[PDB]
Amino acid sequence: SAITKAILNADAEARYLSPGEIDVVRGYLASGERRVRVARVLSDNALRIVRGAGDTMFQKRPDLVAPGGNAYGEVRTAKCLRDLDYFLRLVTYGVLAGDTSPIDEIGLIGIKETYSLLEVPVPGVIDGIKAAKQQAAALLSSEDAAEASFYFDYVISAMS
Amino acid sequence: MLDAVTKIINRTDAEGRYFASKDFDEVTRFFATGEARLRAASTISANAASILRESAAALFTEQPDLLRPGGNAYTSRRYAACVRDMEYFLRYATYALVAGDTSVIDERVLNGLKETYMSLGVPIPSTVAGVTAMKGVVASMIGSEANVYFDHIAKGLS
């Protein structure tokens, strides 16, 4: 989390937390209620967010679910929706942790190699994650949506 | 029609007494919850078409028979009238949500409606099922803020 990153920093120079790092930890603990609210909204609405994101992604890119597409078939389409759900849950983790470390550890490191070898079109994943980002922003206030969009765009930029 | 402030004023006027501390407190409670109710009403207004579409989908998925030949929703015109009545209920629920009082519903919606549905042949229980479906649709978007007014419409029908 943010706390872990500050602790790792202070440990590299073998010192106690500095005023800046205390400010980071304090401002993170201050944001706890807002992060919990955002994560609750994204978590309780994961099903409709993933359904909507998948619908938008498939309308935008029909060839994925057309014969010969990477997502063609019930099983492959199910795994596609499961990947979108995975990335939504990773976004919730990133919101809760106040940094992108859990997203990197669980989902991003190796996802480029994984998708290259499975022949999964990364732009399609980006389209689905953008759709999920707008579907989440529909469910959140302006500040909460802005908070979630940071981690959504972080996922997108790691893809691209 | 009345709202919360007007009904309080009427209650004090019936007794011919100036406002007391309890009356002022109730007024302040109404004023405090104003922004949330306005935001809920604005969200409903911005999404009226989608709410209508998905509530009609829920109603006619639960009770397909209305859309079959012989059903009271079987025509272009009777289906249009059904979704039109649902629009009535939604718009007046928004009005009562802003006002904080159900009198607008009783006057503009429920006044003579049960007898009219009997005269036309409209199945009231199915209409109540539609109002409950729209309750669920609106709760999925704005929370439980507007449940009271939809319940009032449903009980007035029932």
Binding site: F150, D153, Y154, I156, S157, S160 | -
Partner: protein, 162 residues
């Protein structure tokens, strides 16, 4: 490197004085623009790949000889290095905009770059054209005030090269 705050700090340390009203005005001015800078940096970071795609496409459309045989950007390696350098310029302009000071462009970018490009044979006029293309593309994403700010650092890079 030096940001605007540490720039004020360095001036006042060298002259050995506590902050006065003028220093506090400079610091208030930096803090007031801080949210715009953070927003622009987040927007550029989210869009950096798109900015580079658009800018490289405009540059190679305006100068098709770069990517055809005999051009400095003709091979997969030299094309990759070209757009890599464009990634440099975008990233370091974003750093300088977030810091509100061009010192990082002197230390980390412009020092020895003309000599590197002249030794390699990399055409510097075309590099300036690419920097201009990135300036317009970035301005197309970030909005009026952020565009005007980022353009300062893009122009600093252009002047340091050209």
């Amino acid at each position: 490197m030096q940001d605007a705050i540490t720039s004020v700090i360095n001036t006042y340390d060298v002259q050995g004085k506590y902050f006065d009203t003028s220093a506090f005005d400079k610091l208030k001015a930096y803090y007031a623009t801080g949210e715009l800078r953070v927003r622009a940096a987040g927007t550029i970071s989210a869009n950096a790949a798109t900015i580079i795609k658009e800018a490289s496409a405009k540059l190679f459309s305006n100068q098709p000889d770069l990517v055809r045989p005999g051009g400095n950007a003709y091979t997969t390696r030299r094309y990759a290095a070209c757009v890599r350098d464009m990634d440099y310029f975008l990233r370091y302009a974003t750093y300088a905009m977030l810091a509100g000071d061009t010192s990082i462009l002197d230390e980390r970018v412009l020092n020895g770059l003309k000599e590197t490009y002249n030794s390699l044979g990399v055409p510097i006029s075309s590099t300036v054209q690419g920097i201009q293309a990135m300036k317009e593309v970035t301005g197309s994403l970030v909005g009026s005030g952020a565009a005007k700010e980022m353009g300062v650092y893009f122009d600093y890079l252009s002047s340091g090269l050209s």
